[PDB]
Nucleic acid binder design. Structure first.
Ligand code: MG
Length: 140
DNA sequence: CCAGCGT
DNA sequence: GCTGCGCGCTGG
DNA sequence: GCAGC
């Protein structure tokens, strides 16, 4: 499964090979514009390239890197706990994990596995992508 | 300047 | 069902 | 957007 590139340029389109990075990106986008969140994501991923590193991090150090995005202590704590669970808990879908809800889960189900036809997003940008897929999947 | 917004 | 979390961006 | 409430 290779999810197609869209005229909406969702960041999930480039991250889908690594479900942890795609999910981290969803967290970066919690009430935060892509214009600001996505450039900081690359800085975060340079420093915390995997769940294995992030799960050992001190949330206070993560929070310093996230300050300009707001929600910095909440999100730092989320990222460390999510990362721990991703690696250590049994799960089938990432909504079972702390810090991912329907938006992250829907993103995972469209981008990381081939369940896009079963997903009904509430997030507007994800809905635009999903409508576009229905409209275009034959052509693709 | 500043009240409302952002996958 | 509603709240706390939080910054900088947006643009009239 | 998400968890907590
Ligand atoms: Mg969850």
């Amino acid at each position: 499964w290779t999810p197609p590139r869209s005229p909406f340029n969702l960041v999930q389109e480039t991250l889908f090979h690594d479900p942890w990075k795609l999910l981290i990106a969803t967290i970066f986008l919690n009430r935060t514009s892509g214009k600001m969140a996505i450039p900081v994501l690359w800085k975060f991923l340079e420093k915390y390239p995997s769940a294995e590193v992030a799960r050992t991090a001190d949330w206070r150090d993560v929070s310093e890197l996230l300050k300009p995005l707001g929600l910095y202590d909440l999100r730092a704590k989320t990222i460390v706990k999510f990362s721990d669970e991703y690696l250590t808990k049994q799960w089938k879908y990432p909504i079972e994990l702390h810090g991912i809800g329907k938006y992250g889960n829907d993103s995972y189900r469209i981008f990381c596995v081939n369940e896009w036809k079963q997903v009904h997003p509430e997030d507007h940008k994800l809905n635009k992508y999903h409508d576009w897929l229905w409209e275009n999947h034959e052509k693709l």
